[PDB]
């Protein structure tokens, strides 16, 4: 978890592994974010660092504005696409994979997030929930 993540992070199913492109929900002008590392990830032999909903990942912009390209930066995942269990009893999943870019403290670049932000991501990070129009 580290800095920014408020409270205890709780387990869900690991959707995205390393080298997996996902969309940008915020309005900074990145199109899509290529994952290169996952923060707070373990070490096992042959395992690939897998992100999930409400996790901080290092992420390079592949397509977008020339300024935002050519440099790694942190990002919080807000939709998973792989299914996970809520602890009130239902499995669920979103239409597609998505992230938003942000500083290591957990404060956002963009003013507004488009689309439905996941519920666990809103509890864990406050400043995502401030830019969330649609929760769930």
């Amino acid at each position: 978890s580290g800095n920014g993540a408020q409270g205890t992070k709780f387990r869900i199913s690991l959707g995205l592994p390393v080298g997996a492109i996902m969309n940008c929900a915020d309005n900074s002008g990145a199109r899509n974010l290529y994952i290169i590392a996952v923060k707070g990830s373990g070490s096992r032999l042959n395992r690939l660092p897998a992100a999930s909903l409400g996790d901080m990942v290092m992420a390079t912009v592949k397509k977008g504005k020339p300024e935002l390209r050519k440099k790694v930066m942190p990002a919080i995942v807000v939709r998973q696409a792989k299914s996970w269990r809520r602890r009130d009893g239902v499995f669920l999943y979103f239409e597609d994979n998505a992230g938003v870019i942000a500083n290591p403290k957990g404060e956002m670049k963009g003013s507004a997030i488009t689309g439905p932000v996941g519920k666990e991501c809103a509890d864990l990070w406050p400043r995502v929930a401030s830019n969330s129009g649609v929760v769930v």
Binding site: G7, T8, F10, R87, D88, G89, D123
Partner: peptide, 9 residues
């Protein structure tokens, strides 16, 4: 816990 006063299956 984060599930205090909250229904679990």
């Amino acid at each position: 816990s984060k599930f205090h006063k909250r229904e679990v299956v």
